[PDB]
Amino acid sequence: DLASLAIYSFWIFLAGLIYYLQTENMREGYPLENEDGTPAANQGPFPLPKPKTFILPHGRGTLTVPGPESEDRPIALARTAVSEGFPHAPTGDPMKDGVGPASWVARRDLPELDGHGHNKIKPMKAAAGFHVSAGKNPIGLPVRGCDLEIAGKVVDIWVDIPEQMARFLEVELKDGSTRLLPMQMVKVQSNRVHVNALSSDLFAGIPTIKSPTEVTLLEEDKICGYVAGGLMYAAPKRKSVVAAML
Amino acid sequence: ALLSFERKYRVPGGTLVGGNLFDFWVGPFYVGFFGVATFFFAALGIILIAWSAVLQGTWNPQLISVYPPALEYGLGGAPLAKGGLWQIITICATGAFVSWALREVEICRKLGIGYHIPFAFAFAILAYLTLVLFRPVMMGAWGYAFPYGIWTHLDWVSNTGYTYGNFHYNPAHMIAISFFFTNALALALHGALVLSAANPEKGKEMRTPDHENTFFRDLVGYSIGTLGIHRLGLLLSLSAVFFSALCMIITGTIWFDQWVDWWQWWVKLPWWANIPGGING
Amino acid sequence: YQNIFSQVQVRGPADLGMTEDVNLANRSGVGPFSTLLGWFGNAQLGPIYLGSLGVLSLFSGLMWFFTIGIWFWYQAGWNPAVFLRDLFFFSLEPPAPEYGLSFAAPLKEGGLWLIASFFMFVAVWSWWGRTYLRAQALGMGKHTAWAFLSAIWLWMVLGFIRPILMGSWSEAVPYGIFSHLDWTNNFSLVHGNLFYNPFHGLSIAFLYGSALLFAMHGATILAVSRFGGECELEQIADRGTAAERAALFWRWTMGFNATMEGIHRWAIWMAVLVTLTGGIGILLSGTVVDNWYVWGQNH
Ligand code: BCL
Ligand code: BCL
Ligand code: BCL
Ligand SMILES: CC[C@H]1c2cc3[nH]c4c(c3C)C(=O)[C@H](C(=O)OC)c4c3nc(cc4[nH]c(cc(n2)[C@@H]1C)c(C(C)=O)c4C)[C@@H](C)[C@@H]3CCC(=O)OC/C=C(/C)CCC[C@@H](C)CCC[C@@H](C)CCCC(C)C
Ligand SMILES: COC(C)(C)C/C=C/C(C)=C/C=C/C(C)=C/C=C/C(C)=C\C=C\C=C(C)\C=C\C=C(/C)CC/C=C(\C)CCC=C(C)C
Ligand SMILES: CCCCCCCCCCCC[N+](C)(C)[O-]
Ligand SMILES: CCCCCCCCCCCC[N+](C)(C)[O-]
Ligand SMILES: CCCCCCCCCCCC[N+](C)(C)[O-]
Ligand SMILES: CCCCCCCCCCCC[N+](C)(C)[O-]
Ligand SMILES: [Fe+2]
Fold first, then answer.
1. Which of B199, C95, C154, C214 is an S-S bond match for C275, by CB 3.0 to 4.6 Å?
2. Was B116 annotated as part of a binding site?
3. Ligand 4 pocket check: which of C207, C208, C212 to mutate, most ligand atoms within 8 Å of Cβ?
4. Distance linking the first and last C-alpha atoms of chain A
5. Any ligand 6 atom below 6 A from CB of A48
6. Do B144 and B181 reside in the same domain of the chain?
7. What whole-number distance in Å separates Cα of residue B270 and Cα of residue C2?
8. Which of residues 89-118 of B touch C (CB under 8 A)?
9. B120 neighbourhood in chain C, CB within 8 Å
């Protein structure tokens, strides 16, 4: 029966596709490791895929995966139990050490370029023609932290050019310097911009950028990682929803 | 075993219940209070199903079927082998599904990410509950719910459908279907676009987002953008399940006849209702 | 902030895009910006590329639509009020069985259907060539053309390949809103309930699965947009904490995960399998299997 042969074949095909799909998704993170960093005995039933090479744009190099794990910076965490499967507590300040919800990856310390070779992200003040087209313009608004204290003011928007979208808000602190706040971690309101992940006192700690006109991938990650980590690590200083409605 | 970049993320915190008591992993799996609650519900529920198989007299996966209580029982309880087992299993399923979502929430907290995933999953739970709890209650009987059987639940779809003629005529069902199709269309487009940029013609540098914008713009005169495409995918798939739950919640509660007849309201509109000609004149 | 809608829209000069090997002469000018669209995605409309293939496709496509419409006006007796009240009831049906695969059917009894179909045939295929060539001019992979082929396969099976194998145009789908629905139901009834068709069941699996996976993927990406997760190509070339957290959410949740590039392979196949298995299930219906219940009984 032709139909029976078809269904029979499909399942063989499907099992093979899944096999193929699973291996392709092992180009990052594998081989697996034991918590001490050594190769774990059980790697699973799927073998690592054959390497492939990505040729990066504007000659920024190549990427071959799978390959040796790129993470080699110190991880400020210590075992909490003798057996495997347990948490690892931060040895110092997780926010400053970059661990847990505050982790960041050592990405290439260069800004991302668009297809025309120009910086993909730019302060709006320096993006010819870019303007706020709709919604409440946050520029000029005071920025509030979860402790309900003012942490600074919005002095510009950093736009993704190709996507024509707002990626970060540039906030000036009391000392006159500025920090980049992830756009999807702020709430723009009528009289101000509210940041739930951070208490005013933690803004100064937000990693800074070398050049004030651009931001690199490495910096993006440090900024994004730090801001998110605040949700867990700044909770003690985060005022309730009640005091907020006041 | 951990991914080569995982350790720095396995820190304490994020749990919603039990402090650090259940804050640990088993292999790649994270546990937490809701991790055990899920195991509990899933274990018991699977056990009660197996028992229903025993009472039914079969171990065949293609034949095992747990039916809800007959219309007689209305919304009351019922003997285990005659609808009661289905009632308890349903509770275990609801409890396991909700626990899985709450467990996903603790996972979100430990990793510092948004809560979109469990939120979206709740739509699925809401669609399940709509068929097994919400519609049966508005209709006055657990009998109106579907059976837990691989083929029997399809019989239930079939019979329920034809109870109103060709179910295609359900207007809410039409909208849901459109979202399901549009969704699969968008899913295919999204995967292909990204893949086509990451894997350009052999020997070429990776394409960029600009190339992605240019491809679609050249093709259909519009590019929704990376953020928008992920917003659309979630929108389409959530809208499909929502209009699914809606198309059923109204069937048998506020609409009882053949769905095809519903469309007559538009046809009977006074200004054209009696003009001879066409299909309806 | 759930990032479902943008809080503030930003806009720069019209973006003309990449050139690569594209013939700029065939590229129109930028269209209007839509603040409305801008809340959800890009506000920019256009520009669009329209070479000969594109003009051909659009022309045929319109001729297809217009052919169906003229017949609808005819069925309405050219009365505007009737056209609107019975719009979903009109239908352009294919030739009766008596005509087999011939092109001799009278205009009002099949010929118009065939003409409309010829225009649709040309429209879709030239549009397919277009998905391939627009990617080629940009040096991109041909994934879109291949995925599109899968959908074309179900379409082809429904109005061309199966009808031919069956021996008559009468087997094809009629051009009408409700009529194509009646055809679909009838098709199941005539083949002994499609729920017993194994490929129809798989197709459903992938359709449900496509909503499952896109809800999963869309929610995941949004959940990590706080770290620039949407910059997927960027995360593929230089993995960031967004890609790592995304992967760990799923690894911790269900025991396994994907990569920023790999997840899109899972996605394109999940979707492509919908119509791929679907087309197979329909092609076998009436050519190899008359009744799925019956066939199911011997398997
Ligand atoms: C002859 C039959 C009738 C008909 C009768 C009905 C009836 C009756 C119903 C539908 C429903 C639906 N119909 Mg119909 N339908 C017909 C023809 C069609 C056609 C077509 C091409 O012709 C299409 C595309 C559809 C499409 C649809 C979908 C929109 C909808 C089902 C999706 C849904 O609600 O998911 C909802 C999602 C869920 C239910 C998922 C819940 C998942 C839970 C939360 C998690 C499970 C976890 C699991 C147990 C653990 C597994 C183990 C792990 C893997 C390890 N119908 C014909 C005309 N249809 C249904 C609907 O709207 O339902 C609300 C419905 O009830
Ligand atoms: C409103 C829609 C109708 C409905 C209409 C249909 C139709 C029509 C079809 C199915 C089909 C299937 N349905 Mg159903 N189905 C309904 C509700 C459910 C529920 C539930 C808790 O609500 C579950 C678990 C299922 C599960 C299933 C799968 C066994 C099967 C194909 C997988 C698929 O599409 O996956 C989408 C999800 C994934 C791909 C993720 C992986 C999920 C795995 C595959 C599900 C395991 C289910 C398992 C056998 C149940 C045992 C659990 C153990 C006891 C713990 N249905 C409701 C009542 N269903 C298809 C089939 O072939 O049926 C025989 C089919 O054609
Ligand atoms: C009573 C009716 C029967 C039934 C009869 C059928 C029949 C008959 C068929 C399906 C098919 C399908 N059924 Mg069913 N089905 C039933 C019940 C169900 C239920 C349920 C109860 O829950 C579900 C979930 C499904 C689900 C499905 C899908 C998996 C599958 C369609 C995918 C699709 O739409 O591709 C849509 C994609 C296409 C049609 C591709 C072609 C598109 C072309 C290329 C584009 C043309 C564009 C055009 C020019 C116009 C341009 C528009 C402008 C730009 C705006 N069926 C009941 C039992 N079903 C189909 C299938 O594959 O079955 C195996 C099918 O043929
Ligand atoms: C917008 C809605 C769409 C959606 C979204 C969605 N689904 C999700 C998620 C999201 C966002 C998850 O995060 C979660 C996930 O972890 O995915 C891997 C999930 C998930 N969607 C699943 C299935 C699923 N989703 C479906 C649909 C959809 N999911 C929608 C299209 C379907 C169908 C029928 O279309 C199915 C079968 C699970 C694989 C997974 C959630 C896993 C889970 O809850 O595990 C809990 C524990 C168990 C092993 C359960 C034991 C249950 C027993 C107590 C009882 C028996 C169940 C009985 C009621 C079934 C009867 C069977 C018959 C009908 C055959
Ligand atoms: C003109 O009137 C004004 C108002 C402008 C416009 C009015 C137009 C209107 C109201 C148009 C309405 C159109 C509708 C409702 C279309 C609906 C289509 C539907 C519902 C479903 C489509 C299913 C069609 C399929 C599966 C078609 C498949 C076709 C093929 C596979 C190609 C077949 C080709 C053939 C037979 C030609 C053979 C010849 C050769 C050599 C290639
Ligand atoms: C619906 C089928 C989708 C499931 C495909 C199964 C993938 C299993 C992958 C196992 C990977 C295990 N691990 C931890 C060792 O990486
Ligand atoms: C292709 C999808 C088109 C979606 C259009 C969506 C419009 C919704 C706009 C809501 C914006 C609300 N507001 C005030 C917060 O900006
Ligand atoms: C008849 C339809 C069959 C089409 C199957 C198309 C699957 C799309 C696969 C995308 C990956 C393509 N590839 C070769 C470039 O890797
Ligand atoms: C990419 C994931 C592929 C696997 C999707 C899971 C499909 C399970 C389908 C069950 C349908 C069974 N059958 C033969 C009765 O139709
Ligand atoms: Fe994506």
1. C154
2. no
3. C212
4. 74
5. no
6. no
7. 46
8. 103-104, 107-108, 111-117
9. 215-216, 218-219
Number of Cβ atoms within 10 Å of the Cβ of C256: 13
Structure method? X-ray
Q: Examine the domain organization and report whether C103 and C194 are in the same domain.
A: no
| Residue whose tokens read 């299997």 | C289
Closest listed ligand to the CA of C35 = 7
Tokens 């900024």, located at residue: A223
| Amino acid letter, residue B274 | N
Q: Is the peptide bond before A51 cis (omega within 30 degrees of 0)?
A: no
This PDB structure is determined at a resolution in Å of 2.4
Q: Give helix then strand counts, H and E, for chain A.
A: 4, 12
User: Is residue B219 within 6 Å of ligand 4 at its C-beta?
Assistant: no
C37 CB within 6 A, ligand 7 = yes
What are the φ and ψ backbone dihedral angles of A160, each rounded to 5 degrees? -90, 120
Distance A152 CA to ligand 7 centre (A): 30
Q: How many Å separate Cα C46 from the centre of its chain?
A: 21
**Ligand 9 nearest atom to the CA of residue C200, by list position:** 16
Q: Does B280 fall in a domain?
A: no
Across the interface, do B234 and C90 touch by the CB < 8 Å criterion?
A: no
Closest CA to B8 of C248, A139, C203: C248
As for how many domains chain C has, the answer is: 2
Looking at chain A, how many residues does it have? 246
Architecture (CATH level 2) of domain A2-106:
Irregular (4.10)
Are the beta carbons of A87 and B24 separated by less than 8 Å? yes
Q: Per-domain residue ranges for chain A?
A: 2-106, 107-238
* Interacting residues of A235 by C-beta distance below 8 A, sequence separation 6+: none
Place of tokens 């995605």: C41
**Do residues C170 and C269 touch, judged by C-beta distance below 8 A?**
no
Cβ of C249 under 8 Å from any chain B Cβ?
A: yes
Q: Which of A21, A56, A182 sits opposite C266 (nearest CB)?
A: A21
Q: Is-cis flag, bond preceding C47, omega within 30?
A: yes
Q: Is B230 annotated as a binding residue?
A: yes
C-alpha distance from C33 to closest chain A C-alpha (Å): 10
Considering only CA atoms, which of A115, B9, A228, A218 is closest in space to residue C238?
A218
Cβ atoms of C281 and C200 closer than 8 Å: yes
What fold does the segment set A107-238 form as a domain? Photosynthetic Reaction Center; Chain H, domain 2 (3.90.50)
One domain, residues C225 and C78: no
Q: Which helix (H) or strand (E) element contains residue C154?
A: helix C143-156
Q: Which atom, in ligand 1's list, is nearest to the CA of C184? A: 22
Nearest CA in chain A to B10: A87
Question: Token pair for residue A39?
Answer: 């190769």
Dihedral (CA of B103, B105, B106, B111) sign: positive
What single letter denotes the amino acid at residue A2? L
Residues of chain A found within 8 Å of residue B207, distances taken between Cβ atoms: 57, 115
DSSP C78: T
Do B178 and B152 share a domain, yes or no?
A: no
* Exposure of A142 in the CB half-sphere (CA atoms within 13 A): 9
Residue that is written with structure tokens 């003011």 in the block: A153
CA angle in degrees (0–180, nearest 5) for C65-C68-C69: 85
Are the C-beta atoms of residues A124 and A131 closer than 8 Å to each other? yes
Structural domain for C19, as ranges: 1-141
Amino acid identity for residue A82 in this structure: V
What residues flank ligand 8, with Cβ below 6 Å?
A: C 141, 143, 146-147, 149-150, 153, 268, 272, 276
Contact C206 B207 (CB under 8 A): no
The DSSP string of C21-57 is T--GGGB-----B-HHHHHHS--BB---B--HHHHHH
**Beta partners for residue A33, in sequence order:** A39, B2
